[PDB]
Amino acid sequence: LAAAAAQAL
């Protein structure tokens, strides 16, 4: 999940 979120940017 942390990576999914980071992907926003």
Side-chain angles (χ1 to χ4, degrees), residues 2 6 8-9:
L9 298 185

